[PDB]
Design a protein around this ligand. Sequence first.
Ligand SMILES: *C(=O)/C=C\c1ccc(O)cc1
Length: 125
Amino acid sequence: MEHVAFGSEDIENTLAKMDDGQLDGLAFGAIQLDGDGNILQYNAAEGDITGRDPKQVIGKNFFKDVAPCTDSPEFYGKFKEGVASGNLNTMFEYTFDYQMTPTKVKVHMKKALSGDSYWVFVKRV
Ligand SMILES: *C(=O)/C=C\c1ccc(O)cc1
């Protein structure tokens, strides 16, 4: 288990040194999106929550194909705004319900230390 807490203020610095292998050790879901919403990373933990096979969704558009239930002003709206503005740090509850049992979750989104990469952290509530 990779000892990193959900909601840590310096999470993006800590996660900068993790490979996909290390990323699977987190106690929470972690997805890495590019500026266009394509999945660059998607760890085992999130997969436990959504049922998705991590290595299968990589390279696919999240908002378009993986998780259409996040295609809303309440989720997709903030991401694109964050991307545009060049910064993002927001926390809010949500419910994933596409092709799965409705699961109330907490979502944390924040720009990565990298230029055009963005994190989506997910935990059960
Ligand atoms: C809403 O988000 C529904 C499903 C879903 C699919 C994939 C991932 O990663 C999260 C949620």
